[PDB]
Design a binder for this molecule. Sequence first.
Ligand code: HEM
Ligand SMILES: C[C@@H](c1ncncc1F)[C@](O)(Cn1cncn1)c1ccc(F)cc1F
Length: 530
Amino acid sequence: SIVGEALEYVNIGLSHFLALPLAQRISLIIIIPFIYNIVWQLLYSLRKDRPPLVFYWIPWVGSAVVYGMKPYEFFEECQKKYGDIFSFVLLGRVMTVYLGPKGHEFVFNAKLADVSAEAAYAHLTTPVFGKGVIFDCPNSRLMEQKKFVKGALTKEAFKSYVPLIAEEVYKYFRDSKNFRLNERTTGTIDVMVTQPEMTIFTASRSLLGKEMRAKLDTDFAYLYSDLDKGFTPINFVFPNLPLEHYRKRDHAQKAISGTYMSLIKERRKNNDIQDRDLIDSLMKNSTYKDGVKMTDQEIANLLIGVLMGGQHTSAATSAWILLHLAERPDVQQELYEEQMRVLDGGKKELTYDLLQEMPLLNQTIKETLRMHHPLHSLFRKVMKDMHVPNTSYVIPAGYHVLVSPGYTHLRDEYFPNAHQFNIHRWNNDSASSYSVGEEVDYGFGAISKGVSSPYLPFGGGRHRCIGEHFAYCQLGVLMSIFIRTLKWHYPEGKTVPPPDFTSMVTLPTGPAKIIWEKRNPEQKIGGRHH
Ligand code: HEM
Ligand SMILES: C[C@@H](c1ncncc1F)[C@](O)(Cn1cncn1)c1ccc(F)cc1F
């Protein structure tokens, strides 16, 4: 009755294994993790305290390809098979998705102790933005940064921003090669070229000021492009490796944060600190509640982060607005009439207050954000085991949770005929968003306590957007002027492009071209240009 002799053959087997020919060793080096992965998934499927796990063939990679390319189609199939809670493996991480309004509640209103945004995102954002801000700091520091930034985003600030943003749009119609309205009465444009440029010109001028805007007229502009390239999903898996892409990013962050710091120390030197812009505002208001001041480097870093985030969501969105309106001359006509009524045939100057009396214009923004949530997925890293209410499911620490309000935006259940563009579904409901009941303050002002609205373009809970009113102001001024100045349509045979879901925001697949025409071919934009 000896089993020790089997224990010998274990040792013998280990030794024969290590002496296999290389062609068999390498072969096993592949085949063993493969086989184990399959065996492990099958075993996992037995657990009742775990949501269903999407099956996958390639270890570590998981469902990355189909999630990367077609995430809403991936979610819809998964939802059909498993219901609203399911997991899937993604480049080494386990993502637990919770679709629908209950998922919105589960993730956006999760306790600070249970989940972490910075543990999910910092490896992406910190190299691009800089140290000490956003996700390179505790949540309570982020809470207060948002509060500081929000202090320059007031009604009175928006009133002074509107004419600056308008000036920038008109200058862009005047000077950009894409328009030249004093020289051309019609032309073709790629909206993925024009919208990122108009967005940076308008956001710089208003949030950063004239100096920083003037800088965009120089080679300095290319640093933003460089810094921009580092803001990609590839940094999500390979945040640092010695390629040139990574060094131009690092250099740009230094050069740009350097430029903001120079301005700041200049203003403080001359005591030229007023109430013009976000820089003025963070110079007067950036001391945390424990007495610690933000450094000039941290202020600069925060400016980069805020502008870059606001850059991509807004540029994506105005691109989509243009793209949906290009096959909807009926809606352009309707918007044009509202412009004529609110601005007295154009004899009134556009102001912030008049912007608020343009419901059809804001409804168009609202509907575009419904069909095109620029962030298709939001993540948190799970920090403690989470029990899913009314289920037997437990999400263990180390998993990630993924929420996707953009997906629910496209469901017929919540939005009848959700794939049709219809600004009138928001009739009598043109607010950018609104809390349906009770409110709470996490540090940056009172916001909706419930996050169960099927429409959640700005998220909710402690990580909620603070730029929505600035985005509406910017998009509003911009579209008010496009509409009053131009008509536009598609080249023959072209229609609304499909989304490119592989980028950081879900911009349209380019080239996305429209043909524009002056409503008033003889109208001229004044001012000087070289
Ligand atoms: C159409 C435009 C925009 C949309 C749809 C949008 C959307 C969002 C969403 C969904 C979040 C929540 C992120 C999460 O829960 O993980 C967020 C957060 C945030 N956004 Fe926006 N955003 C827009 C424009 C802007 C602009 C223009 C700014 C700045 C001027 C801005 C600044 C911020 C900041 C500072 C946060 C907080 C991040 C956090 O607490 O984790 N956003 N935004
Ligand atoms: C972290 C980042 C993000 N990017 C992509 N998928 C998910 C994300 F959370 C983002 O939320 C995007 N964003 C939101 N509003 C504008 N931009 C963000 C927030 C604050 C910020 F200062 C800069 C910034 F990029």
